[PDB]
Amino acid sequence: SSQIRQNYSTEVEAAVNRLVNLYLRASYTYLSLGFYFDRDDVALEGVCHFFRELAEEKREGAERLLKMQNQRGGRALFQDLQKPSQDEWGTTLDAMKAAIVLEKSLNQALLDLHALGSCQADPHLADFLESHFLDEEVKLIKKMGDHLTNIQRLVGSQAGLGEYLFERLTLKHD
Amino acid sequence: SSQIRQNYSTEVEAAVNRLVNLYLRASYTYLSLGFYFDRDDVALEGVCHFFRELAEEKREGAERLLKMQNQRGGRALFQDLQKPSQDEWGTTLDAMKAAIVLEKSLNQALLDLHALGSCQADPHLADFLESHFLDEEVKLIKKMGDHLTNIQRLVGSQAGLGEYLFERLTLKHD
Amino acid sequence: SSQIRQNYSTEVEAAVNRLVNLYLRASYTYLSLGFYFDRDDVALEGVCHFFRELAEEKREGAERLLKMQNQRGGRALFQDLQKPSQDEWGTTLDAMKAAIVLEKSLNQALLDLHALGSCQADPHLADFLESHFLDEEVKLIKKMGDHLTNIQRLVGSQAGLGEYLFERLTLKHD
Amino acid sequence: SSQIRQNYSTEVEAAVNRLVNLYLRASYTYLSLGFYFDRDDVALEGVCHFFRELAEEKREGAERLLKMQNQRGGRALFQDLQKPSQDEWGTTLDAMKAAIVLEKSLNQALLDLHALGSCQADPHLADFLESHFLDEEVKLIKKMGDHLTNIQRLVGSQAGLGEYLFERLTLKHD
Amino acid sequence: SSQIRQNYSTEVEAAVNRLVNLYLRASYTYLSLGFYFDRDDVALEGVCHFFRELAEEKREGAERLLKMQNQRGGRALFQDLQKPSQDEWGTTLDAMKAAIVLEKSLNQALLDLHALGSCQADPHLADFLESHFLDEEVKLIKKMGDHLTNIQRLVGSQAGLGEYLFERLTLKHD
Ligand SMILES: *C1=CC(=O)N(CCNC(=O)c2cccc(O)c2O)C1=O
Ligand SMILES: *C1=CC(=O)N(CCNC(=O)c2cccc(O)c2O)C1=O
Ligand SMILES: *C1=CC(=O)N(CCNC(=O)c2cccc(O)c2O)C1=O
Ligand SMILES: *C1=CC(=O)N(CCNC(=O)c2cccc(O)c2O)C1=O
Ligand SMILES: *C1=CC(=O)N(CCNC(=O)c2cccc(O)c2O)C1=O
Ligand SMILES: [Fe+3]
Question: Which residues carry this modification: N-acetylserine (chains A, B, C, D, E)?
Fold first, then answer.
């Protein structure tokens, strides 16, 4: 247990368990966003697929953190997963704004954990976040910003038409 | 005849012949919907193809019911096929609303026959409808509802443009 | 919304949202079981892999239920996901007993929802559970019972040796 | 010489030559561990192969450090390689405990050199250790801890039987 | 040097070095146009790709001119590359108008150098420009004019919608 643990502070161990909770909460928020856009009275398949893929990416991030907790000899502790902030998510524009708010809060949590790791002279934690999380988040936040600008340009004065065209011509669908 | 019939009531036999008539009427309604959208003054190929494929699916449902009538020892009886309710079907939105009304009436007829079969303790009929009809209808009704929501969002204030874009970007065409 | 909903009671809609919560809670319990057996001071890879695969199967069950909620016109509502019942799971025998208790509680919830669906004459719900859930649960519960009997026969008077051999020779590992 | 050297302190250059010595000493310790388990009166092939592969991994680490010394313009200096701490290594459990002590001392030396590099604002050294050494050591230390727990569970009251089974069923052999 | 130079005037040699500067300035202007359309608050990928490909075509033109300078025995001389005329490029319509102004100025410089070469009875220079530059520029200017007409027809009264559709349906993108 303590049989392998070396240079791994209790502060980092607890912040990693909190980061796992935040990634699994973000995966749950994306599950709810994906099934909202699969409602027959919303019916934007490309938007459903975009959020369901992010639910899987965030679960994968949590699982990588949990593998790392165990590689360093810390102990995974799970807490309840709070339900998402909304039950209905509005338009694609509202949803994409909520998603970029969620990603910036995950990014800030990564940055905060990097700072704590660097303060405690834990370079394996710092490099783990730099290699597997920080650029994934910057790439994702840039894609969401590019989508938000396109959705915004499409609203104009024909909001239904623009929402359809963005789903059909930007987002991946069957 | 009576050489194979077992646990198959006269009530179920007659309701199956009525259900065959309803499926063949729905296939005829879809034949008329498909050729209306092939008119040179309507000219929405994807909508024509969507309804012509449903005419074939409903004929196939009728043929499965007729095969089942004979597997159970009942006797297929055919009645006249009433012509469709309309000679011209309006816009894609009008047509898709008429199609979901038609499917909900077929679905209710399936549900009614399931109830009659379960009341008469005929589990082969009940499982036949559950395996081959009830989820096909729920899947189709959900696809029609998703289309209706998309067509509705596209009308807005440029109805021609929206009808074209839905046909070009949602429905399958050459 | 109500544009497609037919023969789908508010009672079934709410029980489906509760069943989704139970499946996602069982997936979370299995995530915790999988990472406990990946601890360096537990270190039973085959047991970790057995529970991590069940975490994915239970998430998949929840996602099938949510797809069905939307196919029938109900509205997915999510609640908090309660953390698992334990933070540490003991031996493989303790873990496998907790898993069969969890599966029998999911099974009973399926049976209860089947009864509610049959009472409300909702054969699409009943057949959905029969086709995609009831035999999966009976197969899984039988595999867990076969494992429990093997783990029990292996304890005898050399419990460490038996736990190792079961992991190495029954469970799938690298 | 000084023709390419830039931002590379004498302190880092000497600590890299000491780290090369520690990696080549650890490779020699593993050569001795591998041939001890190939003795006809020890005869645990999987344990021999596990340590002989680590002798090659540690030589490879030393060679990467030496390539880096030259890429940065420092000068490789070699010292004597002290013989291993033991001539006979006891049981697999004793050997695996000595190996995890050796790896934690190499890991601490990596961490110490990272700190010196970060203090002297040498990010190429810091990233070199983070990319090629720190996670390799954390992965290896976690595998050794998982093995130690399995070997410990196998001793119980039949130590010979457990040592055989671990070699046969965990470690790679012909 | 003068070892190979034949029929190659100092006037042509200096005008070729000025033409290289103009092509490398046009490549830099296109680099800036490409990265402007990759901004998250502009986000038109097809427009970014169209200008980044032109940055490479103009660098290639400069490199062909420089190879020719050396084949004829002249001496390449480089001057500073003036930064582009704008830091932000407005809409796709503004950008495409600036691009056709830039191409007509490169074309006029080609025509001027052709005239100087023909006046000095330098047919290898004249044929070099005719074979590798004059029709490339006429093809490119015609494609830009076709794009400008399409972008103009799309503005109408819904400028955002038209800018999106042109990028999605004319320009090449992922
Ligand atoms: C409080 C702990 C501490 O030392 N301090 C600085 C940690 N360093 C960084 O945050 C940092 C960020 C990016 C790259 C680096 O190399 C780096 O050291 C605190 O926050
Ligand atoms: C009148 C006949 C009868 O018994 N009664 C109930 C038939 N049962 C169902 O309709 C039903 C629906 C869905 C699943 C079941 O298992 C089921 O028994 C009548 O309608
Ligand atoms: C209360 C509602 C009701 O009618 N009742 C019976 C529902 N039927 C079943 O539970 C059942 C179970 C298995 C197969 C069947 O066909 C079936 O009808 C209630 O629980
Ligand atoms: C003495 C030199 C110095 O500045 N100090 C800190 C060096 N920083 C770290 O050790 C460190 C560890 C992990 C990630 C970082 O970004 C980081 O700066 C000393 O030890
Ligand atoms: C001043 C030099 C000169 O003679 N004069 C004419 C050069 N000729 C052309 O410009 C020309 C253009 C296109 C085809 C030709 O064959 C051609 O000679 C000057 O400009
Ligand atoms: Fe640092």
Answer: 1
